[PDB]
């Protein structure tokens, strides 16, 4: 037979982390 | 025979850490 | 025949860090 195919391309980068909640009162 | 096809795309990475609290009004 | 498929690609990088929140009222 033949040798195996090359490694696949790297994956999508993870989702960005959420923003923090609302600040203290004006 | 010829070599196999290229491997599937990698998994998506972990989500980033959450941000800190918003400044004051 | 052909060889098998190569391993899956490397996993994506951890997501970017979360940002500062909205201002209060």
């Amino acid at each position, epitope marked *: 037979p033949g040798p195996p195919g090359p490694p696949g391309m790297p994956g999508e980068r*993870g989702a960005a982390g*959420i923003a*923090g*909640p609302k600040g203290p009162p004006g | 025979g010829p070599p196999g096809p290229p491997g599937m795309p990698g*998994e998506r*990475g*972990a*989500a*980033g*850490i*959450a*941000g*800190p*609290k918003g400044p004051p009004g | 025949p052909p060889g098998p498929p190569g391993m899956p690609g*490397e*996993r*994506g*990088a*951890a997501g*970017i*860090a*979360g940002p500062k929140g909205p201002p209060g009222p």
Partner: antibody
Amino acid sequence: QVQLQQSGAELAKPGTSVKMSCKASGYTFISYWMNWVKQRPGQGLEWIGAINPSDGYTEYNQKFKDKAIMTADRSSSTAYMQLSSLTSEDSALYYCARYGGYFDYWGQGTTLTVSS
Amino acid sequence: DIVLTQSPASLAVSLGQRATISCRASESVEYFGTSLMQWYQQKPGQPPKLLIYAASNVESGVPARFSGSGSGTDFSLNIHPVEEDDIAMYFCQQSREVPYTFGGGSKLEIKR
């Protein structure tokens, strides 16, 4: 399986530096933000900071910003932490723990003791 | 930061009975649809072990005996039924606002 091989325990004279290790294994190192926690026995768990290793980027709790200096080596699949100007309060037990929305996998913890 | 507060301090129950622990948060920790509280177990000389994430969901490999419910700012952890394995410290923490913060602890002792 996923494993977080932490470095050996440590004793240091106050005012000295200290560097710590957390060899990661069994998952892509890059893909998960790694964090550090501090436990002082009989008191709660205090989040120190976290470092994404794919870039070296880091985020610290306000408290530990002057103390703690997080590093990572992509070849080694190792995360490091450095604590400087040690002062007794620093003496405690330090965990590195992997984060994927929550702290699913932890190391065993390096243990620091600071005294004359 | 966000301040999480656990109750009670320590509690004693007999094997087979039910044990309930409550985590209370200074500000509620909900992002859009769902709350972001996790429950951890920790035993002497050992790192913490994840039990519950997002309050309702259970980490794969954790026995059903561990049911956790909450919503909003107030959460609780429940075990039915208690077992000799389950002697531990139990912690609540949130992944909603950095810096991430943990509970104060709740010791679980057996009644005998």
